[PDB]
Write a protein that binds this ligand. Structure first.
Ligand SMILES: O=C(O)CNC(=O)C(=O)O
Ligand SMILES: [Mg+2]
Ligand code: NI
Ligand SMILES: [Zn+2]
Length: 331
């Protein structure tokens, strides 16, 4: 068995290997990459996403989100308070202000210590989930706006044509902006490109151990667990590496820098934080190997998780028994 310890693997494809996206994902899996739940891909030196980032300041962040924490430093939830619209130039100036800017630090490990010590005492503002793309239309390789769609994958594997579309999303971050513990909708893959700015630190649980994280989460968030049998779908809970180690949960960590891709694999729980002002692009995708994960994915039916239009058909075709209850949650 390849990668039996479930370590995060790092890949360096050549320009020739960067042509065929599907084939390269399947290669990474032949080497055991999926067992970690997360992989890093460093693009060939010949490649670029676009020519410059000098002209992005007029993008609008219609609903910036203030991430307010509750709990203790290592075990907390966050709620998202909606703020007034602002441009990316306005948001960058806010990120760099004395109130929000990255503190002085020695290295990534010192900044990680500071994050876990102090995150709950501040409320950073995140521009999340903004439909759009920063890839140039002439970038042919690993262009996250030109991937094969999940609807086409389902149709190719299973024969059923379905409605829905699959487009990328932009994220503008600042120091301490946080992504809570989650798997993707319908336990899909994700791919994330860090276009510019400061790093993003990731934590991940191997897919084969995801239920260990769920059992810990039920113990640490007992009211939330009573409210919903899949409350991590709400994407609000944080648990620190120190707490995971104290409870014997297998995990790994890695820092993504500008110019690098990360892939998350089906049922790979992940969480993390941004080091300073940055911009990332991400999209969900599928392969043949995903179908069985999609058929088994948990679902939130309490009404909190509220998701995209295109998840309807995935539940309807892959999980017809659960469809009626899930849809009640959506209405
Ligand atoms: O970058 C972020 O805030 C969150 N991204 C992801 O969870 C992802 O790409 O799957
Ligand atoms: Mg602009
Ligand atoms: Ni994710
Ligand atoms: Zn729920």
């Amino acid at each position: 068995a390849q990668n039996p310890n479930c370590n995060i693997m790092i890949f360096h494809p050549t320009k020739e290997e960067f042509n065929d996206f599907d084939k390269y994902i399947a290669y990474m899996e032949s080497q055991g990459a999926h067992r970690a739940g997360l992989a890093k891909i460093i693009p060939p030196k010949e490649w670029k996403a676009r020519e410059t980032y000098d002209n992005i300041s007029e993008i609008l962040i219609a609903t910036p989100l203030q991430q307010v924490a509750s709990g203790r430093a290592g075990v907390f939830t966050q709620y998202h308070k909606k703020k007034k619209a602002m441009t990316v130039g306005e948001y960058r100036h806010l990120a760099n202000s004395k109130k929000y800017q990255t503190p002085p630090h020695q290295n990534f490990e010192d900044l990680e210590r500071k994050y876990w010590k102090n995150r709950i005492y501040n409320s950073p503002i995140y521009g999340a989930d903004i439909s759009g793309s920063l890839f140039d239309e002439n970038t042919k390789q690993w262009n996250l706006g030109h991937l094969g769609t999940i609807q086409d994958l389902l149709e190719k594997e299973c024969g059923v044509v379905i409605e829905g579309v699959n487009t990328p999303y932009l994220y503008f971050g600042m120091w301490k902006t946080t992504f809570a513990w989650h798997t993707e909708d319908m336990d899909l893959y994700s791919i994330n490109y860090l276009h510019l700015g400061e790093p993003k630190t990731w934590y991940v649980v191997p897919p084969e151990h995801g239920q260990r994280l769920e059992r810990l989460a039920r113990e640490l968030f007992p009211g939330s667990s009573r409210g919903c049998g899949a409350f991590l779908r709400h994407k609000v809970a944080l648990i620190s590496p120190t707490v995971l180690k104290e409870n014997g949960i297998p995990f790994n960590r890695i820092t993504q820098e500008a110019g690098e891709f990360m892939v998350t694999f089906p049922y790979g729980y992940h969480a993390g934080f941004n080091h300073g002002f940055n911009c990332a692009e991400a999209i969900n995708f599928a392969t043949p190997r995903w179908i069985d994960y999609g058929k088994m994915a948990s679902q939130c039916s309490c009404g909190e998780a509220r998701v995209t239009f295109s998840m309807d058909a995935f539940v309807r075709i892959l999980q017809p028994e659960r469809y009626d209850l899930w849809k009640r949650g959506q209405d």
